[PDB]
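## tool: complex_structure
## caller: assistant
## args:
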Amino acid sequence: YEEDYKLALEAFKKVFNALTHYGAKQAFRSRARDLVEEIYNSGFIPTFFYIISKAELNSDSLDSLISLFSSDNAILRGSDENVSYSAYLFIILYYLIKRGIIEQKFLIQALRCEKTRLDLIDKLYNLAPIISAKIRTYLLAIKRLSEALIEAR
Amino acid sequence: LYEEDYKLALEAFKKVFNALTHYGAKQAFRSRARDLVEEIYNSGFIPTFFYIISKAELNSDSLDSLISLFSSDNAILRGSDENVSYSAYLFIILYYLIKRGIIEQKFLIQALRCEKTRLDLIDKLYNLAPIISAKIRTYLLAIKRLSEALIEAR
Amino acid sequence: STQREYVFIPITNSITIDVKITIGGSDHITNIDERGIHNVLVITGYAVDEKNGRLVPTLDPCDYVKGILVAGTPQQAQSNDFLTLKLPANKLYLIRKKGNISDDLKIYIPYSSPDARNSMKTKPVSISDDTIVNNIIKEVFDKIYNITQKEKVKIEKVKEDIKELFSYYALEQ
Amino acid sequence: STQREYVFIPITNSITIDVKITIGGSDHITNIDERGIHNVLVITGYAVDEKNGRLVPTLDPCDYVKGILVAGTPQQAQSNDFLTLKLPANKLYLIRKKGNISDDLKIYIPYSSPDARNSMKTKPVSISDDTIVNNIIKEVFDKIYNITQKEKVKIEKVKEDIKELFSYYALEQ
Amino acid sequence: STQREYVFIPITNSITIDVKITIGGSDHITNIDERGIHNVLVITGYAVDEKNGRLVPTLDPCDYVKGILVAGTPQQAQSNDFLTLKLPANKLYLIRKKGNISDDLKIYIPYSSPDARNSMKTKPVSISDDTIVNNIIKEVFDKIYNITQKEKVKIEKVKEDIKELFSYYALEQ
Amino acid sequence: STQREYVFIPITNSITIDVKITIGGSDHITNIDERGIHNVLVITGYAVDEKNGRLVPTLDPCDYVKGILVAGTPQQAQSNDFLTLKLPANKLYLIRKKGNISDDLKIYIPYSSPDARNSMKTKPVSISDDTIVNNIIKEVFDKIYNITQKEKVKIEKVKEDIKELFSYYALEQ
Amino acid sequence: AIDFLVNILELIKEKQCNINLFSAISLTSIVYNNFGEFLSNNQSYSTNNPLLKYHIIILNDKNKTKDVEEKRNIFKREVAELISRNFKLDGEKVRNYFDSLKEVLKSLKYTIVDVEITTRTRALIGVSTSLGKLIFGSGISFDPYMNLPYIPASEIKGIVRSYIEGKLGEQEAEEIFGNEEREGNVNFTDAYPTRSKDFLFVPDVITPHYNGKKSEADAEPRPVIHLTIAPKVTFRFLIYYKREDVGKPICDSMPIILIRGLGARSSVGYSLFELRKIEVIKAA
Amino acid sequence: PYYAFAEPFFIHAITHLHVGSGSSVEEEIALPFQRDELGYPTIYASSLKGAIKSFLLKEFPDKRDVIYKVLGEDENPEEASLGTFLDAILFAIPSRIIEIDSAKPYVWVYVTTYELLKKVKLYLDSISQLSNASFSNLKNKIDTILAKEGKNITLDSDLKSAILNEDFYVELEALNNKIPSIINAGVPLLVLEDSIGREVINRSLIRVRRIRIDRDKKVVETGGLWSEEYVPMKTIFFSVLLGKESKESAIFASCILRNLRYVILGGKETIGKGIVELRWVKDVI
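## result:
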């Protein structure tokens, strides 16, 4: 069903609220325009490696994400690009949780260890041809929402 | 069964990550992965490969540690933060060569520990150069992303 | 082993007195350096029912609570329902780490019963109503860190940081 | 209506008198189907003292345990020192969710004290020594499974998936 | 002169009783100085079979064995079964070596039948199970260096010298 | 089945005394297919004392004995002075692996027990002298290679690489 | 083939300046990084490869390992000296290249400014670029098809722009060098050496003792042999543009920005240059 | 015929060239060069057309109507464009070489593959079918080379072996020296089999790293480091310029395409990249 546009509205709400600096918002808009086309061309797992490389999931931005799951007032801190990539990674993980592709219980004890985070990436590798076909319209909606709401810098 | 570039990178990086005990070792390995790929492109795989072997400062216990890492997964890379970083990137490259079936593990080990077999390893790499240079840089790019994702700056 | 005592950010007024000494020394790890609350220890898997606010030992990983790690004891008054611990002070989950740590520690956790009389259905909650954080900067963050309102001239940053950096799980039982 | 017993997959030889009732119910949850075991749970936030294994509560957000979901009561004369818990049954870190949950249940869980005369120390464990793994199969699992020799042709699936599937971070002291 | 023996360290120990004289001279190649074991020996190309503890001469170089060095004699009924070897302290293979010895060596390493009846499906065998390690400590460490565990307060050091290094190859058939 | 045999490349002459069977069937695995000699296994861990040559084992992995793989049981007056062994052939160290393997490779290798009196000394060797090449090229290969003499027209492709591709670590004592 | 390797230093010294220096150093690095192995009776038994000289000399006997290590340090110094003395500059191809390029630009109706500059102190351009990196650790910005060291046009443009926005504000720069919404009005070619005095490269060292150290108890010199561009080497590049405006700011910027650095380590007086000649060819 | 004129030509990189494909999570480089479906450097005909059309419009102001009729009116297009650019396929790329056993020593040699020559021959055939205009001098040269396919060969030298881009040791065979100087120069030309010439040509490109500087710290900005691929000087690309029957096509091919020799291709025009000479086979083979 079209409830993926609804899911995109929810995710974009959480992100648009957790990016306090407008520079972070515009940077997320750029990430949104780019990464969906890159998932189309180069496939999911390559683009996911690219994204988690530039999100710099140290230990602190990680907890901001786990909180952004729950607390509607959690914020993302860091560089404009460093938080835009982490916001897009949150978009991805949000979709993966809601559509129950991977249990949020698992995804939580992964974002806290660096010792089950690699197992998170392995799991996402076992599911890349599924995710690649699912997230298409959801990320297209996220991109449309970002071009619609956030000001072009 | 066959593992593609990114999955092999995952497995190799996972076997390395658990062996680099000190975090400075991990950060130096991150710095390695982030530039040895551009080095391999500009200078060639064989020059850079033997440069890595030298900078790993083997001719110690580091060698049996590096060969044990292939199987034990309880092994630890021992040395300074520069030596183990190059030793681990060397393990990365050896793991690729072995899993892609380009060079056997026994020959690689014996060439890595023997004055004699090293020169014919140079010969063999000049034989097998296209088979390697064709696709090693994608696997190493995946290694670079895993490094700059799972490890932070200084 | 140098003892650092644990206590979190509740919303029920079970906050004020949870250690007889305030500092008991001149050391601390939960800094405040005009850059928010550094080193906020998090402990996932334990939920807090603010009515006699204490971590309930859960096994749900998503149920997290993150509070201060003061340097103190259980006052030698609440030692039955507590559980001691000596840990290498890196088995923690600190946040915004600024330096090295003792690597030797004794903490005592506000710890409620396993609640075998009911199913521990968990409730998530966040923090708003800025007076909810002001009155608790009063309730503890005066009687713990005298550097508040005496050395901090930009405390509004710590206000928004307690507001954004703190959320937790309850049971409403 | 239902209280469960949760025993782990240790290496030491205290596995059998830790589980008294075989099932004590109608049908099992930790039960094979000749395609791999299903419905195993990963309690996290606790340690394991290798001596007479009992879950040591820890602050590590990465130290866990792995065990089995069985009905009935442990040993009829214990569970006071245990981790007694009645649960909403949906906040549980199970593996291989191929069915749904009772949406309410209860388990007893083993426990030793913090018992700190040294600092906390746990290290990864990957249970192996397939002789001392198939012995765990035939000691407690075949005991917990009164279905064996009535449905069991393939003990080697149990053999193959327990060596790789179950792990923990033992005290190793 | 001086001769040394070679007791490989597998998961079990059917190799303790092997020698007449405990120390020999003052010579013991392997060094334990509160810092880890030194002068350890690994042998390329050879294997060990866990049953009736001796070595098994395989052919592939990857098959390696990691035993240690103690000064002794082969129990006075060998060199018809054991393979005596004199090497001048520079034509051998040490790992993490402490110093130099003076080229006076005649090692008496184990040896079983090559078993040219089945295929040597060699198996990479690490070491785990602290419970199997606790006693093997005294069976090999104070067995030869009985100053360890006398003044040596390094309980975990000589334990940690093995659990991550002595990962040999075995047949297990 | 089939049980092969491996013989070295010496500078001395004791080769006829033991090798009997040329092929024992239809086709070998070792080959001169106008591409160079292939599938020549390499031993690593032995030393060559080759006056009336038989292999002695060393401790070094850089000591390598290299020859060709003859199919046939040598002389059937032995199996009490040979190192008999049947590797499953994926634990064999070869050169230029072209084709597959018999999935199991029983090898009879001429062996001299150590009998440690001196201290071993190993020296590498590269060979030369086209005559001292041919006088092995087509008397002992000829004994084992018979599909030559009609297609192996340019013997140079073997007489030129026997002096570059083969080596060992000699003992001479 | 390994025989290309064990005979590559002979090639450097006999084919001097007519060999591909990039590939030459790249292959030399294999010998350098397997020194202990190329010396164990694998000198190709020739008599003009520098590699058996390290079999005549004895530097240590109590350690074959130390023997190899000291021999390898000597060999690194000798490789630096070989490259510096043998690989000289023949700048006829560059003079032809720049004359033809200037004719091309005159056809395209550009206004060319051909600038000649001379090295005054051992220069370091491209110190992180790969050339000798696998032996020395440092490098030189080397064009492997002109077979020369060069100064990138991007570097020269960046330095000129840094100066122009220093003394004309962050807006006249963008008026000249453009921004994310306009293309620049000034084009830069790379700079290539056209004439030296004696050498093109030159060995050098840098020996940090205390950089990144806590106290004297961990101080230790670590000496870094490397190659630099000899003094008195003359580079030239072109500057072309279509509007007549931008002629003014670049002219006066040229003499000034050169006396201060044009490469690496200018802070300790290394990449100091000298405006040798400037010349402006107006088109229309 | 279908086309009133077929004008194949060669693209000679005067300076280095950068014609990029933009960033991608698959390339290890930030700003790579346009590739083929085969993997060889290319110049998409869209880049070719845009560059040459901008040039022609700025350089032939009175002939603007001819350029518009042939290459397409810029905006408000009431018609299709009479002209056609095919694609610039890599003919021969400089590749750095180490050769012993050769009298004249070389620093770099032209390298190509049989596959690239096959595509050149394919373009030539296809445009002979549609244009009633043949270039079988080229076709004969190229088929003479292609006859030898399956073995690395040299054309204007006697090189036995060599090492190309310091990683690929190859052995060569000479060609019948009746084979002429297709490049029309004094540099040799290797034609490698494709499974090795692919790696050679790919490693034959220049990957330069640039940076951006903190104007105050005078150090490198964070994230201010990236690579770019250039194609060396004197690289050769081959493409064709086609034109339907028209009176504008006549004047275009007969006046414009004569006086068009130099252009600027691709990006990085201000750091001196992108200058190009166009040699028409028609004019001078």
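## assistant note: The first strand of chain G starts at residue 111 and ends at 119. Chain G is about 40% helix and 15% strand. Handing back to user.
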